[PDB]
Amino acid sequence: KRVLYVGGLAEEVDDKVLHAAFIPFGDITDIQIPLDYETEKHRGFAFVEFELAEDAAAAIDNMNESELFGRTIRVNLAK
C-alpha cells in the first residue's frame, strides 16, 4: 500500500516533477513511468512507490483531483 497510480499527467510532467510534487508527503522509494518508444513520450500515467504507506495515503488524500501542469490528475492505490 506504498505504491500508488497517478494518471492524467500532462506531457511535460516528468519523473523530477513527480518527485518534487509528491516529496512533500514523505520520502519516495521509486517512480515508474510507462513511455511509448515510438514517440518517446509517456502514456499519461505513472506509479509512485513511497517509503511509507501512511505517507502514500496522505499523498492520495491530498493529491487526488489536484492540479499539476494545469490539469487535474488521478491518484489512487496502484493495487
Partner: protein, 266 residues
C-alpha cells in the same frame, strides 16, 4: 560495547544501521553520543534525513528541561542541513521549534524556511503554514490578513476563504471585514460561496450586515441596497434591512424619508 561499536563503524561508517544500534545500545545517549553520531552522519553521507529528524526530536524531548536554547539551535541547524529536502518532517520540526522557542520574531525565519521549502511548491507545506499562521496569530492579529491573502491569492479554497472572512469579521467594526464581505458578495464563480453553504442569500445577509453600523470608509447604501432591491426574492427581509440601512447609516436626515417612501412604494 563502545570499542566494538567503533570497530564496526571504522569499516562500516557508510552504514547508518550500526550507528543507530550504537546509539540504542548506550542508554545514556547524549553525553558524547548524540554529537558523535551527528558528526559521523554529517561528515559521512548526505542522507538519513528521517533518522536525523527522529534523533533531533528525541534529543529535544531529552534536553527539554531548559526547554529550548541549545536544542532549538541544534534542531534548526540540522533542519538547515536539509538542502532541498521538502519532506513532511523538517517543516514539522521547524514549526515545533517555533512553537516552543521564541516566536513571531524567529517565526519570520520559520516562515522564510517554509517559503524556501515551498519554492518548488508542492501543496503540503502552505496547507500547514497557513493554519499554523492563523493559530500563531491568536495573540496578535497583525499577519493574519497577510497569510489569508497569501493563501487566497495562491490557492483557491472556499472553506479557507470563509474561515479568513470570519477571521477579518472578528475585528472591531470593518477592519478587512468589508474587504472579505465584498469578495464574498462578488461571486464571480459558483464554487466558493457553495463551499460550506448553499442558500443564495448568505451574500445578501453579509451585505446587510455590512450595511450595519460599522466604521468602513463609506460603503453606505449603494451596492447592498441596490442588489437587495433588484433581486431580493425574500418577503420583508431585504425591505426591512433596506429601511434600517436608510434609517441609521450616517445621521439619515433625508434617508429616513427615503425609507418611508420606499415603504410606501413596495
Amino acid at each position: 560495547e563502545d570499542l566494538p561499536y567503533e570497530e564496526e563503524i571504522m569499516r562500516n561508517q557508510f552504514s547508518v544501521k550500526c550507528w543507530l544500534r550504537y546509539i540504542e545500545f548506550k542508554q545514556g545517549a547524549p553525553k558524547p553520543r548524540l554529537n558523535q553520531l551527528y558528526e559521523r552522519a554529517l561528515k559521512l553521507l548526505p542522507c538519513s534525513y528521517k533518522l536525523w529528524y527522529r534523533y533531533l526530536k528525541a534529543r529535544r524531548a531529552q534536553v527539554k528541561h531548559r526547554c529550548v536554547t541549545d536544542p532549538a539551535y541544534e534542531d534548526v541547524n540540522n533542519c538547515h542541513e536539509r538542502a532541498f529536502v521538502f519532506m513532511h518532517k523538517m517543516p514539522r520540526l521547524w514549526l515545533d521549534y517555533c512553537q516552543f522557542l521564541m516566536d513571531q520574531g524567529r517565526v519570520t525565519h520559520t516562515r522564510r524556511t517554509f517559503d524556501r521549502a515551498l519554492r518548488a511548491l508542492p501543496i503540503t507545506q502552505h496547507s500547514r503554514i497557513w493554519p499554523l499562521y492563523l493559530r500563531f496569530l491568536r495573540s496578535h492579529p497583525l499577519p493574519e490578513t497577510a497569510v489569508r491573502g497569501y493563501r487566497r491569492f495562491l490557492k483557491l479554497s472556499p472553506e479557507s476563504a470563509e474561515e479568513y472572512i470570519e477571521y477579518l469579521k472578528s475585528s472591531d467594526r470593518l477592519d478587512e471585514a468589508a474587504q472579505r464581505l465584498a469578495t464574498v458578495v462578488n461571486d464571480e464563480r459558483f464554487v466558493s460561496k457553495a463551499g460550506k453553504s448553499n442558500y443564495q442569500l448568505w451574500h445578501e445577509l453579509c451585505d446587510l450586515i455590512s450595511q450595519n453600523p460599522d466604521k468602513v470608509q463609506s460603503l453606505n447604501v449603494d451596492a447592498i441596497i441596490r442588489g437587495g432591491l433588484t433581486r431580493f426574492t425574500d418577503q420583508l427581509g431585504k425591505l426591512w434591512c433596506s429601511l434600517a440601512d436608510y434609517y441609521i447609516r450616517s445621521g439619515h436626515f433625508e434617508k429616513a424619508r427615503d425609507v418611508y417612501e420606499e415603504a410606501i412604494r413596495t
